[PDB]
C-alpha cells in the first residue's frame, strides 16, 4: 500500500538528516578531544621523566608494592552506541586476553561494556557510569578505588587507541604494578606512583573518547549513505505503486462505463 | 465519503487507531481535530491559548519522536526532554474514563467541567507538575485526581 | 517512523526510569552538614532499596 | 601544569612554594631538584618583578638549570 | 467491509505464526465488541487484566533488547511476561 | 492542473499550524513567479534578505534539537532564525 | 491467478527473487512456504520442533534486517547478534546443489535424506557449529559436507 | 510522459538555483547536464579528453565539500588544495556574458568558438594559469579575455 510507503520514505529521509548532522557533530568533538589531548601528552611526558629518574635509583630486596607485587580487568567503553564496532572491538580484546591468561575481577567503565560483559558472565566488582568528555577528577576516583582494591593482585586497562578517523586499535595496558621506561627518593616515589597511575587512566580516557567519536564519524557516515540507497529503492517502488493505482482505478471506472 | 464530510461540519473529532493502540481513550487525535468556535473572541484567550499550547508541545514531541527513535532520550537537552515528559503527560491527561465504558475499564466514569479542564491543562503546560509521574495523569478526571493518584501511588 | 520498535521501546524505557526515580524519591522521603548529608546518604540508599523488592 | 592544562608558561624571576620539609625559593640556576609540595599558596615573581600568588592543592616541583616546572594536583 | 459488520475480529499474522506464537493471534489488533459480558464470572476474575499486562510486556521486552542494566522490577516483569506468552 | 495554470502558489501545512506557525505557510515551497516586481521598494529592501536568512535557518534547523559543540556563527544563525520565525 | 491457486494446494513452495539474487538456490522462501502435512502427529515431534525452530530464528533475523540496513550489526544486542549468526548460517544451509543444475553451477548434485536433514539443522540451531564459518554451510548437502568444507578452509 | 520524451533527447541542460545563487550565469549544472554526442568518435579525442577532465575536477571538488565544511580548508593535502583552486577557476570560466543581457549588465555579450573553448579550458586544467586570481575567469569570453581582465 502507498499509504505505508509515503510515510516510510518520510521516516528514512528525516533519519538521514540526523545521521548526516551527527557526522558533523562527531567531527567537531574529535577536534576538541584532540586539542585537550595535546595538553595531557606533555603533562604525562613530564611525569614519565620524573618517574624514570626515581626508578633508576630505587633501592633494590624490597622496593614498594605498587612497583612490583611479588587479575583485574579494567574496560573503558562508551555509554551511548551508534559508534560502529568501537565497543565490540574492545570487548573482543578483553574476552581474548582473559581466555588466554586464565584457564578474575572486572571493572566496567561505561554502559556498553558492562551490558555486554554482564550478559556473558559479569564478575563485576566495581562499575562506573560517568555523566559528562569528563576531566581528570573522575579518573582519580577510579584510580583510587582500583588502588583501594590492589591494596589489600594486578590491574590491566583496555581502551581503543587512535590510528586514524577510520581505524581505532583496541589495546591493553598494565596499570598496577607499574612498569619501567625501557625531599627523599622513596618518599616522592610513594606519592608519584599512585599519581602516575591516575594520569595513565586519564590519558586512556581522552584517547578512548576521541576514538569513540572517530568511530561514530565513520559509522554515521555509512548510515547516511545507506539511507540514501534505501530512499532510492523505496521511491522506485512508491512510483510503481503510484502508477499502478492510477492504471487500475481507471480500468474500473472505464469497465463500468462500457457496460452501459 | 469521509473527505466530503469535513466541509459540512462546525466541529470535527478525529479518532486514530495509532492512539487507540496505546490504551488512550477516547482515541482522539489532538493534532487532527478542530472546531470553528475555537477562537479567542468566542471562548476567551485563556481557553484559546491553553488549547494552542497543548497542541504546540504535542507537535514538538511528534517532531522529536524521529530523533529519539534512533538516539534514545539521553542525547536530548534538559529542555528537549522536559517537553518530551510534559507532552507524554498531557497526552495521558487527555485520556478519560467513560461512564458508558465501565463494562470495559472496570472503573467508574468521570465528567470534567470546562473551567477545571482549562485550569488543569494550563498548569501542566506551565510546568507546575513536572515532579509527578506519567501514570498519575493516565485515565483520570480533573487535575486533583492526578495529584491524588500520585499520592495513592506513593503507597 | 522506520525504527517504530526502537522508538517505542526507548520512550517506554526512559518513562519507566522517570517513574522509578520518583519511587526512589518516595523511598528517601520514607527514610528522612546534616540536611545535605542525609539527602545524599539516602539518595544512594533509596536507589539500592528500589533495586531490591524481595 | 595540571592534569588538564598549562597553568604557567612564561619567563619568571623566581617561585616560592611550600615543600614537604620546608619553604623553597627557586632562583635562576638552582641545582636540579624534585620535591613534593604541600597545599597552600605559590608565589610567582614573573618577568620584570610583578608578583602573583595562587592557592594550589599541592603537587610536585621539578627544578633544573633554567626552567622550574610545578606539576600541580587539582586536589 | 466484513470487519465493519462483525462484533470483533481475530487477526492472525504470519510473523507471529512463524516466531512460535500459535495460535497466531495478535492481541492488540484483535477485539471483541461484547467484552467481559461474554465471559463467565470465573473467566472475568482471571482474564480482566491479561490483555493489558501482555501489552506492557511486549513494550518492555523491546526496550530490554538494548542490553542496558535492568532493575529487579523490570526483570521480574520480563520473566513473568515471557512465561505468560 | 491549477498549479500549472497559476503564476505561483502558497502551500499550507498541518504540522506547521499545530506547532504554532500561523499562518501555516511553507516558505520553502511556496512561490510567486511575479515575485520582486509585485512589492513596494520599502519591502524590496528587506524581504529578499529575510527570505535568505530563514532559508539558511531551515537547512540547519536539525541543530536546534542538538547543538552542543557549535561555534559563534552557527549559534547566531539559530538565534536570529528562531526569532525571525 | 496465483492467489487463487493457493486454495487448491496441499503444499506450497514459494520461490523468492531476493533469495535467488543472494545466490541461494533453490530460492525457497522458508517463511512463505507451507504444508498441510507439517503436523507433529504426521512428521513426528523432532521433525516438527526443528522446523518451527528454524523458522523462528529466520523470522527473528528478518525482523532485524530493517534495523541492520541503516545502522548495521554493531547496534544489535549481544543476543540478537547470536541469532543473526546462526540465522545466516541456516540461510546458507538451506541452499543445495542440484544434479540438474550441474550444467551451470559446476557442483555435483546432492540428495539429503530427511533423517539427516532434521539432525543437521537441530545441531546448528543448538549452536554446535557456532565455531564454523558461514561459507562452510553454503551449497552443500548434509552437515558432514559443511564440516569437510570448513576443513578445506 | 517523461519516459516517452527521454527516448528522443540527445542532451539535457539543467538550470539550477544553487548555481544561480553563486552568480554563475548561465545557471547550468556542469555535472547534471549531459550529451549523447560527448564521445571521442563524434566530437574528437581532444574535445572529449578536455571535457572529461573538467568534469572530474568538478567532481573531486564536490567530494571535498564535506571535509572543507566541517573542518576547514586548511586541512586538505597540497594536491587537494590545488584542485580546489583550479576547480573554482574552472567554475568561473564556465560563466559567460550574453548579448541578450546587455540591457541589464551593461557589458557586451560574447560568442566563443568551439576550438577556442576546448583549448582555453585545456590550459586551465593543465594549470597554465595557476598564477592568476579567480576573479580573472569570472564572466568573460575566450581565455585571452581572462589574461586581459587580470592586467586591469
Amino acid at each position: 500500500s502507498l499509504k505505508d510507503l509515503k510515510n516510510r520514505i518520510g521516516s528514512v529521509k528525516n533519519t538521514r538528516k540526523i545521521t548526516k548532522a551527527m557526522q558533523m557533530v562527531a567531527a567537531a568533538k574529535l577536534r576538541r578531544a584532540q586539542e585537550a589531548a595535546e595538553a595531557a601528552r606533555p603533562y604525562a611526558d613530564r611525569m614519565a621523566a620524573v618517574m624514570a629518574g626515581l626508578t633508576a635509583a630505587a633501592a633494590g630486596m624490597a622496593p614498594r608494592l605498587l612497583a612490583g607485587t611479588g587479575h583485574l580487568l579494567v574496560v573503558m567503553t562508551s555509554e551511548r552506541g551508534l559508534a560502529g564496532g568501537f565497543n565490540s572491538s574492545i570487548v573482543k580484546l578483553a574476552r581474548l586476553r582473559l581466555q588466554e591468561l586464565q584457564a578474575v575481577s572486572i571493572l566496567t567503565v561505561g554502559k556498553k561494556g558492562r551490558e555486554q560483559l554482564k550478559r556473558e558472565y559479569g564478575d563485576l566488582f566495581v562499575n562506573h557510569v560517568d555523566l559528562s568528555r569528563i576531566g581528570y577528577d573522575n579518573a582519580r576516583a577510579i584510580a583510587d578505588e582500583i588502588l583501594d582494591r590492589f591494596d589489600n593482585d594486578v590491574a590491566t586497562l583496555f581502551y581503543n587507541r587512535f590510528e586514524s578517523v577510520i581505524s581505532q586499535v583496541p589495546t591493553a595496558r598494565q596499570v598496577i604494578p607499574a612498569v619501567i621506561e625501557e625531599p627523599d627518593e622513596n618518599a616522592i616515589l610513594n606519592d608519584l606512583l599512585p599519581r602516575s597511575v591516575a594520569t595513565q587512566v586519564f590519558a586512556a580516557l581522552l584517547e578512548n573518547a576521541a576514538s569513540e567519536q572517530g568511530a561514530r564519524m565513520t559509522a554515521m557516515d555509512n548510515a547516511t549513505r545507506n539511507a540514501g540507497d534505501m530512499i532510492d529503492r523505496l521511491t522506485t517502488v512508491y512510483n510503481r505503486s503510484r502508477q499502478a493505482a492510477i492504471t487500475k482505478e481507471l480500468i474500473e471506472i472505464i469497465s463500468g462505463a462500457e457496460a452501459l | 465519503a469521509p473527505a466530503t464530510t469535513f466541509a459540512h461540519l462546525d466541529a470535527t473529532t478525529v479518532l486514530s487507531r495509532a492512539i487507540s493502540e496505546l490504551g488512550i481513550y477516547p482515541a482522539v487525535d489532538p493534532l487532527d481535530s478542530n472546531s470553528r468556535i475555537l477562537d479567542p473572541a468566542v471562548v476567551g484567550e485563556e481557553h484559546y491559548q491553553v488549547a494552542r499550547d497543548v497542541q504546540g508541545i504535542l507537535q514538538k514531541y511528534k517532531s522529536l519522536q524521529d530523533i529519539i527513535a534512533i538516539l534514545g532520550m539521553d542525547e536530548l537537552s534538559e529542555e528537549d526532554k522536559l517537553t518530551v515528559a510534559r507532552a507524554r503527560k498531557i497526552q495521558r491527561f487527555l485520556s478519560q474514563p467513560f461512564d458508558v465504558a465501565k463494562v470495559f475499564t472496570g472503573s467508574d466514569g468521570v465528567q470534567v467541567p470546562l473551567e477545571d479542564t482549562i485550569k488543569s491543562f494550563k498548569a501542566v503546560v506551565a510546568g507546575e507538575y513536572d515532579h509527578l509521574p506519567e501514570a498519575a495523569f493516565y485515565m483520570v478526571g480533573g487535575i486533583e485526581d492526578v495529584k491524588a493518584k500520585a499520592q495513592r501511588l506513593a503507597a | 517512523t522506520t525504527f517504530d520498535d526502537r522508538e517505542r521501546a526507548h520512550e517506554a524505557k526512559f518513562a519507566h526510569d522517570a517513574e522509578l526515580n520518583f519511587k526512589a524519591e518516595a523511598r528517601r522521603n520514607r527514610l528522612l552538614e546534616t540536611i545535605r548529608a542525609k539527602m545524599v546518604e539516602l539518595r544512594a540508599t533509596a536507589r539500592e532499596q528500589i533495586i531490591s523488592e524481595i | 601544569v595540571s592534569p588538564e592544562r598549562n597553568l604557567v608558561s612564561v619567563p619568571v624571576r623566581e617561585v616560592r612554594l611550600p615543600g614537604a620539609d620546608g619553604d623553597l625559593t627557586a632562583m635562576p640556576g638552582h641545582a636540579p631538584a624534585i620535591v613534593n609540595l604541600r597545599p597552600g599558596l605559590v608565589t610567582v615573581v614573573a618577568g620584570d618583578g610583578s608578583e602573583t600568588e595562587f592557592a594550589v592543592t599541592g603537587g610536585f616541583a621539578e627544578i633544573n638549570n633554567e626552567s622550574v616546572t610545578l606539576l600541580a594536583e587539582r586536589g | 467491509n466484513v470487519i465493519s459488520i462483525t462484533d470483533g475480529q481475530i487477526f492472525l499474522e504470519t510473523e507471529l505464526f512463524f516466531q512460535g506464537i500459535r495460535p497466531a493471534v495478535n492481541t492488540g489488533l484483535s477485539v471483541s465488541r461484547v467484552g467481559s459480558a461474554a465471559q463467565t464470572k470465573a473467566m472475568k476474575s482471571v482474564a480482566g487484566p491479561v490483555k493489558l499486562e501482555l501489552a506492557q510486556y511486549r513494550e518492555m521486552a523491546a526496550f530490554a533488547q538494548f542490553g542496558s542494566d535492568l532493575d529487579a522490577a523490570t526483570q521480574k516483569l520480563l520473566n513473568r511476561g515471557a512465561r505468560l506468552t
Side-chain angles (χ1 to χ4, degrees), chain A, chain B residues 1-4 6-155, chain C, chain D residues 3 11 18-20 22 26 28-29 31-33 39-40 46-47 49 55 58-59 61 72 75, chain E residues 1-62 64 66-85:
Chain A
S1 55
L2 190 130
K3 189 205 299 182
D4 192 36
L5 296 168
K6 288 167 80 83
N7 296 122
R8 276 202 51 94
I9 292 164
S11 176
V12 180
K13 259 163 185 178
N14 293 324
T15 42
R16 186 186 61 182
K17 290 196 288 285
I18 300 156
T19 63
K20 177 63 173 95
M22 285 201 301
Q23 185 180 4
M24 302 205 277
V25 179
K29 302 243 190 104
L30 185 143
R31 292 157 43 262
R32 292 205 202 160
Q34 228 62 114
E35 286 146 34
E38 288 172 333
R41 172 55 43 75
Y43 181 63
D45 281 330
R46 287 201 69 76
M47 266 210 178
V50 182
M51 286 285 289
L54 295 186
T55 193
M61 180 170 65
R64 191 162 202 76
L65 275 71
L66 284 69
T69 317
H71 251 84
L72 207 156
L73 308 171
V74 186
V75 183
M76 308 293 193
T77 43
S78 68
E79 290 176 6
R80 299 157 211 170
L82 298 188
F86 169 76
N87 299 300
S88 74
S89 59
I90 197 162
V91 172
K92 282 172 188 170
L93 188 346
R95 285 178 214 163
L96 181 56
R97 206 65 50 195
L98 171 47
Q99 200 71 52
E100 294 164 35
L101 292 167
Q102 282 272 45
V104 283
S105 165
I106 301 162
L107 168 45
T108 58
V109 180
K111 295 181 184 179
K112 275 286 157 140
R114 189 209 287 197
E115 151 181 345
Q116 285 196 41
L117 273 62
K118 280 184 159 189
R119 281 201 172 185
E120 295 157 35
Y121 57 97
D123 303 331
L124 305 203
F125 284 69
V126 183
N127 315 280
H128 276 262
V129 171
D130 51 314
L131 278 298
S132 70
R133 185 162 214 74
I134 204 155
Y136 178 80
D137 299 314
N138 252 236
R140 179 153 282 180
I142 235 161
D144 104 84
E145 182 58 31
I146 195 178
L147 285 160
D148 278 23
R149 277 180 149 72
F150 185 86
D151 188 51
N152 203 294
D153 207 62
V154 282
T156 283
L157 203 162
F158 300 92
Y159 73 95
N160 279 294
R161 289 172 193 178
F162 322 126
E163 261 193 37
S164 66
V165 174
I166 282 76
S167 47
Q168 297 92 33
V169 181
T171 55
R173 188 88 74 176
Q174 190 180 124
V175 56
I176 319 170
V179 186
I180 307 95
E181 279 282 310
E182 306 190 59
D184 305 0
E185 199 106 64
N186 295 37
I188 296 165
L189 184 133
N190 198 7
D191 64 57
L192 286 186
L193 264 161
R195 284 204 280 95
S196 64
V197 157
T199 60
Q200 285 195 308
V201 171
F202 180 57
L205 181 87
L206 297 180
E207 287 177 301
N208 195 53
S211 289
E212 190 204 327
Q213 284 169 319
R216 291 171 128 260
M217 225 188 301
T218 54
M220 300 325 283
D221 175 49
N222 294 353
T224 302
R225 298 291 164 183
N226 292 357
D229 284 9
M230 192 186 281
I231 286 155
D232 293 8
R233 294 161 59 261
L234 283 179
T235 45
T236 53
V237 173
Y238 168 84
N239 283 328
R240 263 172 245 162
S241 47
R242 186 188 68 77
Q243 292 183 32
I246 297 164
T247 29
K248 289 187 179 177
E249 197 200 52
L250 280 163
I251 291 157
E252 292 167 359
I253 292 158
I254 290 139
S255 288
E258 278 181 54
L260 303 170
Chain B
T4 317
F6 280 90
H8 287 111
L9 299 170
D10 300 303
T12 70
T13 302
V14 175
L15 264 39
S16 162
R17 203 177 297 279
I19 298 171
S20 184
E21 279 167 7
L22 283 157
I24 302 287
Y25 288 108
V28 175
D29 190 348
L31 307 180
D32 205 15
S33 296
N34 82 291
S35 176
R36 68 144 188 75
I37 63 152
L38 194 76
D39 190 308
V42 183
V43 294
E45 192 83 48
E46 186 185 49
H47 195 162
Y48 183 77
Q49 213 72 1
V50 175
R52 205 268 280 172
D53 283 10
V54 168
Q55 284 163 334
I57 203 183
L58 290 161
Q59 181 58 68
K60 286 161 193 176
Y61 170 59
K62 191 176 110 189
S63 299
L64 255 186
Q65 286 178 317
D66 305 358
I67 298 83
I68 68 201
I70 308 174
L71 319 184
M73 219 155 103
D74 293 20
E75 205 61 35
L76 273 61
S77 98
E78 196 50 63
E79 258 280 305
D80 310 339
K81 74 220 306 177
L82 205 57
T83 71
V84 161
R86 286 169 198 171
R88 297 183 99 268
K89 286 161 191 199
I90 286 163
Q91 172 164 208
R92 283 165 169 75
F93 194 54
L94 289 161
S95 67
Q96 194 171 337
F98 275 12
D99 209 320
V100 157
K102 193 157 79 79
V103 289
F104 307 122
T105 62
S107 286
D108 278 48
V110 79
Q111 306 83 19
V112 190
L114 175 54
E115 188 173 297
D116 188 25
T117 293
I118 301 167
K119 182 172 171 178
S120 301
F121 278 93
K122 191 179 183 175
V124 179
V125 300
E128 293 168 44
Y129 293 108
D130 294 350
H131 61 278
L132 299 188
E134 270 178 8
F137 301 86
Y138 181 63
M139 280 285 285
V140 307
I143 200 70
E144 317 309 310
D145 301 25
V146 172
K147 290 185 283 184
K149 185 166 175 176
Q151 191 185 330
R152 84 204 176 183
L153 285 170
Chain C
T1 71
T2 307
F3 311 91
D4 74 314
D5 180 49
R6 286 164 57 79
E7 162 57 0
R8 68 176 68 179
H10 273 132
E11 299 235 48
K13 187 146 189 169
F14 296 113
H16 182 79
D17 297 321
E19 191 167 24
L20 199 70
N21 285 9
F22 182 75
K23 292 171 178 179
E25 287 290 323
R27 270 285 188 173
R28 83 175 180 77
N29 294 11
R30 184 263 144 192
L31 267 67
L32 300 148
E33 163 74 315
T34 310
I35 293 160
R36 322 307 275 186
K38 295 257 193 167
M39 176 162 182
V40 176
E41 201 77 354
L42 309 163
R43 221 139 170 200
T45 316
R47 283 170 178 206
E48 263 97 77
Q49 266 162 21
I50 290 286
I51 303 161
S52 49
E53 308 97 39
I54 196 171
Chain E
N1 279 346
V2 183
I3 292 166
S4 85
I5 296 160
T6 62
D7 304 315
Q9 72 290 66
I10 311 181
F11 182 50
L12 311 176
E13 298 183 293
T14 57
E15 185 168 63
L16 293 175
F17 195 63
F18 285 68
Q19 88 192 45
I21 293 88
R22 283 137 177 274
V25 182
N26 186 304
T27 56
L29 297 176
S30 303
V31 216
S32 169
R33 286 117 167 288
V34 179
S36 293
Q39 298 181 320
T40 62
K41 255 68 170 173
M43 179 60 78
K44 193 196 307 199
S45 75
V46 294
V50 175
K51 193 160 153 103
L52 168 72
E53 175 175 14
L54 282 166
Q56 279 167 50
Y57 163 66
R58 282 189 296 287
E59 288 187 305
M60 213 164 287
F66 312 152
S68 9
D69 221 59
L70 307 171
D71 52 293
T74 350
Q75 288 176 44
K76 290 284 178 185
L77 290 151
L78 291 166
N79 279 307
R80 270 188 55 175
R83 295 182 170 72
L84 276 161
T85 296

